[PDB]
Design a protein around this ligand. Structure first.
Ligand SMILES: *Cc1c(COP(=O)(O)O)cnc(C)c1O
Ligand SMILES: *Cc1c(COP(=O)(O)O)cnc(C)c1O
Lengths: 512, 512
């Protein structure tokens, strides 16, 4: 009952899962904790800041570059002054996307401090586009109302009264202006996929499906409709139910009718090339083509969230380029801080980019000189030696995927699938809510199965894995590109061991 | 004509204000740019990352500590593992607030990556509290409906029909359940002060008054009511107009009546101890007492935004402690990164803290090992030598305030006031929209006066000032506590020069 100032419930829960350890040092693919005698125990990290560490913990090149930047007196805080490095970083990302998509498209960069902040820059810029469309629409409706009023008062035309159910000249116009104003003030909608993860701030949390994380906060901010990635013939009808009308007067020279016109409700569509909250499921070509159709049909941007899939994780710089997702806006974060600093970027296509965004959006820490310098170092490293780092991610990915398939094949009773691509992989666990072992069943019923199994891997095999998915029903594997053959072999041994214990329903060995 | 990838409009506008310079190096209170011949030109920084640099640029202690943390292989990415430093930081801030307020209150800490993110943790936790109040209220109303239904059906009591304007037993109950459900789904409200600045993300932007920054994004997220800080007898009535009711059945033994009960609409009240977007105006005792009354009356938390006013800027660690603002939640950011990294914290009083927040809120970069280590260094520095650093801020603040008053006294034709406290000060500029000089008048009409004057200070006196307030009608002075007497004298000379040119309406010298 001693005073506690942070993390009491978090630490309590981690301890009961078998994950209550303090990591005191990290290098490459290894984190170290202290045993009861104070000796360092090496642990293989498969979590790696949820994919932040493409080059591992504390990479010597990144550490050396950061120390040189600090010793040179880099200007970290230079707000409202010329910062050329931002333009230099945007140019590199622009060149990389042209190379990988073969499209000669140009993107403006706005920097931020987290993946959530970068996704919220996109939500905001998407809402600027929607307000432009609304102004244009309402300007036309005024002109259509003036013309109709002209025709009805002068006498040239008669008002059809079969149309009045949708709401007498001046009264009908005021009634249309009221209807349209109510509509204009309504919150927009965002479209996402089922299992989507786009961050946990007031705006972005509405775009994250995981129900315990989101549903408490529903009232704060614009909702998302979660489109079923699996059943995509249902997406058409879900979006069609979200159609909303404004009213105007249509003159067909001699007759005037009240009619509905489309109102732009949807601000943006968001998509992850590889779906973190769905267990690392890659977007299929069929789902990509449906997202393209919705973007072309609604005229709102398609925002590609590469916060996790970017900076080479999938075996290309851009996961979207590898899977043929043709986005309007793109976001990057995790790996761009080199595993030491915090940085993110929204890339917005220049033919849609509203220059007001460059001066009405800002942040104290955004575009700081230190994360800028380190971003340029990370881009230099991932681009080095004629694209060999992408080739190495692809080869390491194949090796790790092959091992995971070989484990699934012999353990199909407890593993349902292997998902993801490059070095962003996961095993799907079969439901254990009917397990013979009461301890396993109880944990699976509370959605803690994945964490319990992660605990086993830590204490028995010195391997750090974290679960994914809304019931911790997936085990994530997202190590650095320096993961060795020996470390993949040790992971295979650890998994065969874990899935043999789970098969044998050994609750005493798995659950504390 | 050439390809540009970021900042074309930002740089264009900075160049035309006379602020188009690249800072290449920074130490203490000085940033350096290169002249045409490639020599470093020293510039005195009064902006200092908008108050981030209480210890100046690249403080050797902070640089040395950051390099040691990188050389020791600090675990930056240790998500879902024991990170004791979070608890250790919260303990220090907890002790500091007890010392400065004399209250023996305890606070839980949630870390984030920016001031906006910390303010959004508070908005989210405030919405958890409101949902708890709503559940309790709706649980009572069910019990009140059951009891009334019992009394009306059994026969013991009669339903009064003078009360039905607010909507047979079953019908009246269904009509109350409909009314109450509509109300329950309505968006909450936040209360802020006029001129409030609380960040620029989807949620926090609604809490920031500056109209060009906010009004484009109105539709996205729950609105704020901006309370007039100046006219506080009007606040009572503005908040009273926001009262909303749910309905229930009140049994007074023989008689059952439909009655209104209070619905919790307001999620939180936010306040800055020193109001950045109002031109560094301190909260008066009268305004503090009104915020206290609203918090006690509505039962929502009072959130104190110390993102700018904290870590000693005002001459205490907490600005709220100095001005007697008794908050439920507190936020810190700018100076806690030591001018090199990005970190923020929400302190939520433990008797209000809902433990679900510890496991349903998270962020990839939050609570990273590197910013944690540097937070502990910054707290060690500001607390050192029995509170001498607070004494030094107070005496440097007095010296700088006295100089600014001495300039106002001789230049009252162009300067209306000195605002703020400690080392967070500003000059208010008199309106120049009627200036004889057409160049000055034109800039003042566009709200760019402060930027133009800042340009003068840079090119003619090598002094970096940035404006504040919604029409750049204030000049900010927020240097490090190492600002020398000689640097204050050079600033006085520069300001006398600027305000003499402004008096003389010398548009050719002031505007390019
Ligand atoms: C981690 C993550 C985010 C949010 O990034 P933060 O830095 O945690 O705000 C957004 N999208 C995806 C796909 C992520 O994995
Ligand atoms: C700067 C500031 C913020 C926003 O902090 P960021 O780090 O820019 O998101 C919020 N509140 C106040 C009072 C500030 O000065």
């Amino acid at each position: 009952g001693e005073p506690v100032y942070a993390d009491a419930v978090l630490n309590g829960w981690l301890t009961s899962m078998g994950l209550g350890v303090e990591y005191v040092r990290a290098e490459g693919n290894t984190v170290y904790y202290l045993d009861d005698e104070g000796r360092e125990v090496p642990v293989l990290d498969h979590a790696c800041g949820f994919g932040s560490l493409i080059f591992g913990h504390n990479h010597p090149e990144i550490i050396a570059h950061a120390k040189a930047a600090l010793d040179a007196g880099t200007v970290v805080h230079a707000q409202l002054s010329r910062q050329p490095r931002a333009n230099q970083i945007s140019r590199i990302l622009n060149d990389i996307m042209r190379r990988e998509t073969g499209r000669d498209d140009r993107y403006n960069a706005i920097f931020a401090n987290s993946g959530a902040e970068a996704n919220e820059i996109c939500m905001k810029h998407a809402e600027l586009e929607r307000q432009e469309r609304i102004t244009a629409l309402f300007a036309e409706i005024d002109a259509e109302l003036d013309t109709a009023r002209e025709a009805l008062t002068t006498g040239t035309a008669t008002l059809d009264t079969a149309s009045l159910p949708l709401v007498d000249v001046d009264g009908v116009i005021a009634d249309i202006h009221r209807h349209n104003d109510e509509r204009r003030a309504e919150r927009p909608l965002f479209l996402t996929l089922d299992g989507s993860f786009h961050g946990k701030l007031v705006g972005s949390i509405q775009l994250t499906q995981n129900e315990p994380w989101r549903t408490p906060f529903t009232a704060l901010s614009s909702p998302a409709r979660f489109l079923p990635a699996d059943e995509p013939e249902l997406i058409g009808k879900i979006v069609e139910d979200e159609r909303r009308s404004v009213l105007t007067l249509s003159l067909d020279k001699d007759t005037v009718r009240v009619v509905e016109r489309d109102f732009p409700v949807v601000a943006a569509i968001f998509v992850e090339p590889v779906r973190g909250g769905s267990g690392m499921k890659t977007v299929t070509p069929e789902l990509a083509e449906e997202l393209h159709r919705l973007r072309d049909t609604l005229g709102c941007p398609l925002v590609v969230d590469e916060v996790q899939t970017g900076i080479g994780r999938t075996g290309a710089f851009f996961g979207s380029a590898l899977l043929g997702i043709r986005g309007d806006y793109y976001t990057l974060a995790k790996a761009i801080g080199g595993g030491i600093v915090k940085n993110s970027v929204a890339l917005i296509r220049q033919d849609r980019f509203l220059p007001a965004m460059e001066v009405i959006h800002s942040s104290t820490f955004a575009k700081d000189g230190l994360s800028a310098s380190i971003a340029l170092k990370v881009l230099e490293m991932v681009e080095a030696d004629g694209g060999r780092v992408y080739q190495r991610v692809r080869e390491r990915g194949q090796r790790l995927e092959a091992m995971l398939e070989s484990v699934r094949a012999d353990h199909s009773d407890v593993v349902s699938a292997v998902w993801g691509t490059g070095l962003m992989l996961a095993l799907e666990l079969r439901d254990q809510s009917n397990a013979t072992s009461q301890a396993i069943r109880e944990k699976a019923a509370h959605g803690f199965l994945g964490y319990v199994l992660a605990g086993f891997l830590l204490r028995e095999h010195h391997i750090r894995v974290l679960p994914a998915g809304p019931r911790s029903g997936f085990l994530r594997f997202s190590p650095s590109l320096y993961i060795t053959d020996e470390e993949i072999d040790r992971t295979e041994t650890a998994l065969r061991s874990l899935f043999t214990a789970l098969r044998d329903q050994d609750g005493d060995r798995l659950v504390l």
